[PDB]
From a paper:
KtrAB is a cation channel with a nucleotide-dependent RCK domain. The structure of the KtrAB complex revealed a homodimeric membrane protein (KtrB) assembled with a cytosolic RCK octameric ring, formed by the KtrA protein. KtrA binds nucleotides, ATP or ADP. ATP binding induces the adoption of a square-conformation by the octameric ring and increased K+ flux activity through KtrAB; ADP binding results in a non-square conformation and decreased flux.
Author numbering:
A (entry chain C), B (entry chain D), C (entry chain F), D (entry chain E), E (entry chain A), F (entry chain B), ...: 6 to 222
């Protein structure tokens, strides 16, 4: 299908490998720690003990063949950077590397990483957003001003109808989905009821959504 | 406003503190490492050097007053656990803790953590999704089966109309937004045109969205 | 008689199980590693392969029946903690747990471990005592100031009598036993002789015993 | 004073180093793990990062000068053995090594270890002894058969006199000390009273002490 | 005076250090190989064994103080690159690095090396020039086209005057110096004689000098 | 024309071969490594895979015919020596050999090498010279005391005339050339201007040139 | 036939493997250096890259099956000792080990090596014998006093008969063999002729043989 | 008597010097390592610290006077070669040099070494011989097919007579010597008895000797 190499079976890397394996892709799980290789042996096509900073080992893995290589090493800047460099000189098409800090990001950038990810930082931003606003369970920003938001329904919304809560005119936002007891309602009709503690999916302008949050719920 | 305590100024914790501070909330940035405290001094209300496992220091911080306390310590399972536990005995309303792996999650759960987060794991899943499918720029999962996806438009979608691409009937999914050259169109009418390289926001079942990606683009 | 459960057949745990079995007590030896179960099969009443963190397995062991359960898992803090906790919720009378370090000691303490042991640490202290003082073979502290000490006799003590070495008056300490060529003399009379390289058992104040070591031997 | 080298800052080794440093001896704490060196920097004279497996590094430490070298590495048999061998060829006077199992003990023995210690095993035996007999707080074995035991007094012993409990004739054992509310009585006269929950220090044959425990308390 | 750090005491680095030391400059000779440190101990102010890729060792050297740091490591691209990066982050004013190949040059360039040198390559070019033309003793290129050349005089030039050999008009080149039996004539007048086997210093265009070599000598 | 044999296509040897080929000479590129024969195939007349220590292969090359043979093997002292020796016994007119160190230089010297070169060492000296003195770009020593130096112009020299900087009288040195933006001025007249960052070519006594560097620029 | 394992393909080991292979025995050539494995690939049944100190690799070799295992590692005392120990614990029938010095010999002895060889030392003794006495080509000592010696015939022995050189009576020694131009004469009759430069095999007392060497040749 | 110079006191060289000294020859032991000079001071006439590659030191030794000079340096090819070369230019009659591998043998050969020895290799062949055939104690090859072998007698040979074991007719081989309890019997008569565990010296064809070994013992 498509070949993926996950170097560094951490939380992040391990998750990548496990999920990708669940999707049914050819995933090579590489780690210097034997116990990590042993741990993700069930969740990969081939799990190998290797020092990714050692070139001959990298050739012994046959990494040149892979379309995507992911360096999920993030506290050892040295190892990460070095590995990325090795892969670059070996003409790997796509090199995705975790990064630790702004300068590690810089060095990855300069040695030609294709995509640099900061999982902890981004998730930090998200969870902080959820912290300052208890109503938001999840969300996605369409742009600087427009967003789709998932909200936890309060008592103020219990037994209320979509036509009762006229968001499309009063607030310029549109409701997309209602999740009740695990059951799911997509693009619901105005007659539908929202019960408390249910998942509500609204879409619109950020400020408008906050307006609805304040006065509605 | 609302008082937040961020213990552990890593990428994740640091991001939480910085972002929350950008929102203009009272954020207490706590760290045992002096240089971290010095680093996030600009991005907090009060930045303090403290050993969060030492109770008398925790009383010296006056942590009982805070509505939300975030334990962003994730490689030192031990310290994290003790700290969370300390906060629990001190009757803190909301304790959100960063976890490393499943059993650390278990012990946090059992000592009564209010919310446990796995940033690296979740972001790993997301990036893996983006890896197996180059077309997805971003997304949000409404549930195990239903999701809203942001897609990068290919040439197959160039100059195509919403009524031309009948997703609501043929694939059971609904288009929510179109982003063209930075300009943004929310809940667009069937006459609207989609140009390649534009942002397309579809909503529906995961498998159905994959179907549309397959035959459509 | 009395029922004991030893979870974790390490050196320490294995020693507990083997020794208890030699005394003729009902000892259930539990381990996740099959080879450990096979190893201590001869030295237990019932040796079972079980994941002690998995509750249903813990019920399958019928651990609720046991008066004493010993968690001898010490490098995997997580397994130890989770297991100890499981036992606590199952209302086990006495839970003795092996600890690795101070904060793990803390979390064990707070989740209600009944007795926490640091074998390596304590034995370290003892062997260090023996290191700085080649004369001391072993000892037991009665209190902060008073102790019973086992000493290796030097040439200065060869062919010396108990009445000759008046410890009861000159140093306020009392000799308890003399071990000569494996032969043993308990509470010896003043006429008895001490030959070099023999075991001498003195009792008294620490500083006083040091005094006697200094001027006497 | 006297120079000590502690190689391997584990629980056991770390305890040795910390305790020895508390005694005010010159202790060189050596470890391959940087974080361990950093941890015990406060509890040593000189804390060095070194792989004790490399000879030139061992010369860089100047280990030939030390009277006592302690190999506190116990799960890595290879490293332990090798270090011990290196030290032996370097004509170190006293080499004390922590062992894991019987065969590692054998190889240490054959390559000329001066003293081999099994902390976990021995402490296991002790704790097992305390487990089968809740009454014993501590003890020291004078030989295979004779021992001095510290006992927790029960209700059966409350308000009883030493002459009342004639251990010297009825059981052939002798009482050495009584600890009451922290206060301490050494080699007490027959008129003295024992109150419950006090520390009792008996001396004699193992079987005899068990007998006294049985009928007496 | 000025402080120099030479990391990597190979031939190139060693020559740098030795020569600089001969000039009487403060030169810190750093090497991971003990024998190299021992070799250049006589030819430096301070010769230290250090792993230049290890940051804490680099701080232990106190390298931040130095005006010039030279990475003379050229077959280990890894070590060179890594070290250079470390020095850059430590805000070293001038970092001169020895390179192996074009891509190592590239990565050095991108991580901000101040001067990159290819000794073997350049000297290769020079020696090749001397190989195809047996007559040239030495030379210096002013530019791609213009150069000053030192020539060994043949019989065709014996007893010839500067005015006889009109290089300034016939070939557009100018003679700068004549070395006869060790005696030296700088900017000689047209009456001066050139005897064979003497050193002749001409200056001009490369082609013109070759022309003069061809028809003249 | 003239025939050259380059044995060992390293950086140095490869540079020799490539440069010689650019001049249009008959160059035989010999290497035991197939990939280097393949690499320099474009930059030679004939590129052959051969073991230069094997005599029959050397006869198969027909090396006796060549006027110049260059042994550019420098880390394998053995191969270098044996090869050079082979060539000597085969009565080769000119044998130029790359040397690694002083003693290899000795053995090459004694087995009758015609010219021995140390590229790394010499270039080391040069680059070191440039290191202690940022102002000098290049130079050539006419004798122990007299030299021609190429200098990088500073701000102190900007917009200054040759007659303004009277070097011929004030410092006894003479300016030979000025290189401005790649353009070149040979033996310039006193009216000419020197702009900063330009190449300046002075000629005279070493100490005098320094003097001029000191007070002038 | 019989199975041999040669670990360490040095001069000594490599020679063992090559010679053994020439005899047509099943020889497993094991080496950690890939190039050594590649070198002796032609001179073995199976040539494998393996770290003989790593147990799992040793099981991957299936070394338990072999009757004879030879540790030909001699400058790395560590590897030799460790490997030998591994083989011993794996119940290998015959373990022959190359030793470096007296103490390495000691540790090999104590860990139960079956045969310890010192090639350099022994050959040193032999070559020394040939050095002090130029006359001897080869020899074997039957005892402290009696020996069989191979001698290079001089001119004094040319065209001489066995009956002419009466060694059996005049010197008490006996001639055993004469080798002339590769042709061989075993236990030759008294009529036989010895020509110079031939191999002569005499047998007797050392001093007597020396006597014959002195007066005879 | 005869003057010998042993340069390089390793095992091989040291053995040479020691053995030569035991025979009572004038042996000059030369070494650059002071401790080796100190070590073999007792086993030489004159033991000197000298760098054998340095000519003036070689004249300071007065090596021109010696009939035999032995270069026993074998891992430092460079030093060995240069030294041998120095001795050659100094017109030394006999230069015997220890070689490492085939090419070092080549360079020694070509710079005119008189005798080149490979101790490890040859001894390798021998020990290999003994490895494939456990029966042989020692031997000497007269030619490719004919040999004299020393054998360890088994039980099959106990109390057997020479006439009983008719080797001269049945196997075409001849017995030369019998060594019993240190006592020695040369060219024994047919009545003589062979007891087990005695040394037996047979002579003949290799295959024939193996035949006798097979059916006979
Ligand atoms: N040079 C190397 N070659 C191969 N694998 C390596 C190398 N260095 C580190 N690794 C592996 O990469 C993994 C990266 O996880 P690490 O322990 O570095 O923390 P982390 O990745 O930041 O944590 P997480 O991924 O859980 O957030 C480790 O399991 C380690 O075994
Ligand atoms: N007991 C403690 N008390 C206070 N601060 C701590 C404690 N333990 C860790 N920290 C701080 O919390 C921060 C957490 O980041 P850390 O380096 O532990 O990796 P992480 O948090 O798993 O990864 P990330 O930095 O991406 O979140 C660290 O910078 C550390 O200084
Ligand atoms: N979750 C678990 N369930 C059951 N058994 C476990 C679990 N985790 C570890 N064990 C067992 O407990 C034993 C504990 O010994 P381990 O090797 O973990 O080191 P240790 O106990 O600190 O060292 P030692 O006991 O040798 O001093 C191990 O043999 C292991 O097989
Ligand atoms: N080759 C080596 N060289 C130097 N130090 C080492 C080497 N191998 C291990 N160590 C160090 O020695 C220490 C030994 O402790 P380790 O973690 O191996 O468990 P342990 O000693 O059995 O446990 P404990 O000492 O807590 O009972 C470790 O901290 C490790 O960093
Ligand atoms: N990580 C490191 N840290 C510090 N020093 C290092 C490191 N790696 C290599 N070196 C040193 O740098 C020097 C580089 O020389 P090396 O042996 O790599 O060959 P080289 O430099 O190509 O040889 P030459 O310079 O003579 O051409 C070595 O002497 C080595 O000891
Ligand atoms: N015996 C030999 N016969 C033929 N070619 C050889 C032999 N030995 C080495 N070579 C080749 O000669 C080339 C010389 O470069 P090498 O890698 O030996 O280092 P070097 O030449 O000292 O370094 P540089 O590349 O800077 O010149 C190598 O590419 C090697 O393949
Ligand atoms: N840990 C190991 N595991 C397997 N093989 C090893 C190990 N260590 C060394 N060897 C191999 O054993 C061989 C021993 O030869 P080495 O280079 O050590 O010199 P040596 O044996 O003294 O020289 P010689 O055998 O020529 O007398 C080497 O070829 C090496 O590759
Ligand atoms: N240039 C030199 N001048 C004098 N002595 C030297 C010189 N080079 C080496 N030696 C000495 O010669 C001795 C030879 O032993 P070396 O360490 O060279 O290994 P080796 O001789 O091959 O091994 P072994 O002799 O143990 O089989 C060394 O002890 C060394 O000190």
């Amino acid at each position: 299908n498509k070949q993926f190499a996950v170097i560094g079976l951490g939380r992040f890397g391990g998750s990548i490998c496990k999920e990708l394996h669940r999707m049914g892709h050819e995933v090579l799980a590489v780690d210097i720690n034997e116990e990590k290789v042993n741990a993700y042996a069930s969740y990969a096509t081939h799990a190998v003990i290797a020092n990714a900073t050692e070139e001959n080992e990298l050739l012994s893995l046959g990494i040149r063949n892979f379309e995507y290589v992911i360096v999920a090493i993030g506290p050892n800047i040295q190892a990460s950077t070095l590995t990325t460099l090795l892969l670059k000189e070996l003409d790997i098409p796509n090199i995705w590397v975790k990064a630790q800090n702004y300068y590690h990001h810089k060095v990855l950038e300069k040695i030609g990483a294709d995509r640099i990810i900061h999982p902890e930082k981004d998730m930090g931003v998200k969870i902080a957003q959820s912290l300052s606003d208890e109503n938001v369970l999840n969300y996605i920003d369409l742009s600087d001003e427009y967003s789709i938001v998932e909200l936890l329904a309060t008592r103020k919304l219990d037994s209320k109808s979509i036509i009762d809560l006229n968001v499309r005119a009063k607030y310029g936002c549109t409701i997309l989905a209602i999740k009740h007891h695990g059951d799911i309602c997509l693009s619901p009709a105005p007659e539908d009821i929202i019960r408390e503690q249910d998942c509500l999916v609204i879409m619109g302008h950020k400020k408008d959504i906050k307006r609805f949050e304040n006065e509605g719920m």
